[PDB]
């Protein structure tokens, strides 16, 4: 009854550094389709079981989505750190959310490489939970004043992915959607 398809089942997914939020509420959610579609190869879902949540209902059904390299799909988790976890996306601990991921090499991979999916890998500071920061500001590496030129002392924080069909099993791109059901203390709360 509410937009579960339009977030999963579409064509354009933004890169990691500027991932998209999608708030879904004021509906009745039919999770029966998210059970046995046989395509979600990593439906790993923490905190609250999917089976008997139909009795439960609360607001704030925040849903995020993006595309991420295949091997580092494991790195996305509560409290687990690494390359992507420490710099771009970090799921808060004491989680109550629930993650979904699947392979989509059939359509999001073309000959010559799809150089449209960038990502950040340097950052002086770290990330607060459930936060996203986007800025293409360059870094002055050394003592040479840099205006807009690229060189030994001027660095671009974002780096480009290379997606290939012939490439290895762990290198083919995966798509991820993360749900996070949170609620508040105020009563008379809308259900779902």
């Amino acid at each position, epitope marked *: 009854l509410c937009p579960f398809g339009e977030v999963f089942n579409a064509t354009r997914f933004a890169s990691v550094y500027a991932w998209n939020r999608k708030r879904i509420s004021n509906c009745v959610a039919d999770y029966s389709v998210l059970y046995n579609s046989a395509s979600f190869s*990593t*439906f790993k879902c*923490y*905190g609250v*079981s999917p*089976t008997k949540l139909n009795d439960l209902c609360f607001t704030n059904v925040y849903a995020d989505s993006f595309v991420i390299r295949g091997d580092e799909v494991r790195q996305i988790a509560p409290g687990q750190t690494g390359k992507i976890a420490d710099y771009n996306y970090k799921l808060p601990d004491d989680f*109550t959310g629930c993650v979904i991921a699947w392979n989509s090499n059939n359509l999001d991979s073309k000959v010559g490489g799809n150089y449209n999916y960038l990502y950040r890998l340097f950052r002086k500071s770290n990330l607060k939970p459930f936060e996203r920061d986007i800025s293409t500001e360059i870094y002055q590496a050394g003592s040479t004043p840099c205006n807009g030129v690229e060189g030994f002392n001027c660095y671009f924080p974002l780096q480009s992915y290379g997606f290939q069909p012939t490439n290895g099993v762990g290198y083919q791109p995966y798509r991820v959607v993360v749900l996070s059901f949170e609620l508040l203390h105020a009563p008379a709360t809308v259900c779902g």
Partner: antibody
Amino acid sequence: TQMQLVQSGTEVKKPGESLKISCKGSGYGFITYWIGWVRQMPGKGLEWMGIIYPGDSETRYSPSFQGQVTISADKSINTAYLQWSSLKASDTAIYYCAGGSGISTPMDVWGQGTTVTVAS
Amino acid sequence: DIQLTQSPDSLAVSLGERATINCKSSQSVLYSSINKNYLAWYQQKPGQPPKLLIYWASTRESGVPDRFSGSGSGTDFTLTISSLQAEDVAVYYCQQYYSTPYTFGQGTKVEIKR
């Protein structure tokens, strides 16, 4: 059923050797099922051994049981395997594989349990 | 880690009254975002694999009789079977799942007094 679980049969081996048992599932919705192991000594209560995810083989061990048992997973046939490197006198008990959909969620679906003893 | 205790360790009451068991823990088992206590209550008839009755410490699993109930808060919890019958003799168990690891109690046995 919602989920069906089967295990191995009887197990009688001399102490010290290795052992390999398997808990295998069948049904619809298996992909969300963490698999844990529960042990029962004859005439006593229960104690957890270890939990695992069949898909990417993410394991968690009880603090008092680390390093004594081996847990493995196989996603092609959706099975969870337990391996013993050394068999001792305290390895004569009953075992159960318990399914649970998520962490901090109950172990609701259970197998029939397998028995392990050692004698002549 | 969390350790669990049961009270009483042995029990025996006649047919047709209320049976009460208590499970006591150490750390608070109330979650931050969700206001539901993380306890489960199991039963096990001898010679059979254990079969859950109560999940999330305040609900009833599908397919079980409605003559069962639970209560409690903080770190102490109660289980009450109303009008126990002859076929309800078993060994019961309490188990928390606030965080890894989980551990059950020693165990309680129920008998029909006469």
